Ligand SMILES: *[C@H](O)c1c(CO)cnc(C)c1O
């Protein structure tokens with residue numbers, strides 16, 4: 333039947349591994365109609381790879397929103413938002429829409445502000461179907477600071493959930509363990525640990541995971557299935573990522589469908 | 602082997618049917634690594650679908666090109682360029698890269714809705730173009746023939762545009778004829794006729810570009826891109842009362858449509 337319409341409110345990653353590029357790519361891979369409202373443009377210097385974030389004026393941000401909103405998204409994802417104004421508006425449009433799914437990837441960092449954090453806490457967490465911080469973002473969102481363990485991650489998730497998020501996944505990434513990738517998923521009742529092997533290039537892993545979750549929810553998976561299916565999606569992308577230069581390599585967003593499925597072990601902790 | 606890297610220099614079609622959205626989606630469908638240097642942001646009024654083109658500052662345009670060029674595209678496509686200076690830089694970045702394929706979709710109009718720009722395309726892009734993909738209006742402008750009303754006028758247009766330096770020319774007729782010309786032979790490309798065609802041209806040029814990057818001859822790339830876009834068109838859907846985009850994934854997901862090829 334008709335493609336589900338999935339909007340991302342996000343920034344452009346010129347390198348095309350992350351940000352709106354990941355979102356659109358992943359939305360397409362998962363057979364949904366992808367759309368974007370750009371908040372910012374990120375570029376990288378040719379010699380050093382230093383990032384430059386160029387914000388987009390609010391008037392064009394709002395023009396993009398009006399269009400994308402008239403089209404009627406079934407699910408919304410947010411990525412790099414950049415300002416409290418934008419953060420606040422991202423929240424407002426979700427509520428104003430007929431969308432049933434709101435996936436918040438609380439971007440703070442790229443590979444290669446309590447201000448925005450508080451605005452994220454205030455305006456986004458209470459409407460979030462799923463929120464997907466990495467280890468660093470989870471400690472900020474929870475106000476616990478540096479999380480060192482599965483049990484600290486459990487603490488962070490309860491705190492974030494109690495601030496309004498219906499479902500929380502914290503990516504433990506290379507910080508928690510480096511032989512295995514652990515994420516902690518929490519739904520208010522039970523803590524699930526999600527585990528896959530590690531092999532290697534993971535630029536855009538985060539966005540891709542949040543983008544896949546949104547598509548999976550748009551297409552009818554429960555948040556649990558959606559998160560688990562997204563972890564598998566991104567694990568394959570990560571395994572088959574490629575070297576772009578001396579600083580970075582993107583995930584291969586098409587790997588799950590074109591190369592292989594990777595097993596995600598799920599356990600209660 | 603590694604994913605081929607394909608750059609599009611284009612604008613954002615907020616409706617996500619055409620422009621860079623169509624490009625990236627098409628690029629992804631054809632197993633290539635798609636990238637974009639954004640030239641502008643196109644938005645549409647909710648009530649009238651009036652297009653508003655917000656250009657991006659030239660400084661951010663150039664920072665995006667610097668990053669895309671360091672990554673090293675295997676192929677470059679152009680879409681909406683908007684100014685004669687954007688037109689010139691697009692050609693220059695093609696020449697500066699090690700890219701072997703330059704596909705120019707000389708966009709002048711959008712589904713739903715400067716001859717100085719037309720002159721700029723003729724001077725800067727056409728001499729570098731592996732493939733140029735005008736619709737009927739754009740071909741009449743690039744050729745200077747004005748409104749093309751027949752396969753004879755299209756043949757003339759294609760000859761003129763080839764003579765301006767484009768190596769392969771396809772004029773989309775808009776039954777369902779496209780005219781392909783390589784300098785030696787005129788091939789009429791046809792399928793059955795199917796109105797949710799928003800982004801068909803971008804998708805066609807984007808698929809052409811990916812096919813070329815993945816090793817198909819220009820003839821085969823065009824024929825393959827036509828089948829690709831025909832499926833997308835056939836499976837387009839109604840977005841609102843003004844427009845309906847093509848289904849970029851329809852070739853892979855839904856069905857494969859045969860292209861009839863005939864010399865003319
Ligand atoms: C950074 O690379 C990045 C992210 C996080 O990976 C999200 N969005 C944009 C535009 C980025 O550049």
Ligand SMILES: *[C@H](O)c1c(CO)cnc(C)c1O
Nearest residue numbers: 612613614619620643681711
């Ligand atoms: C128009 O919708 C359009 C075209 C031509 O189809 C190309 N690029 C952009 C950004 C557009 O909006």
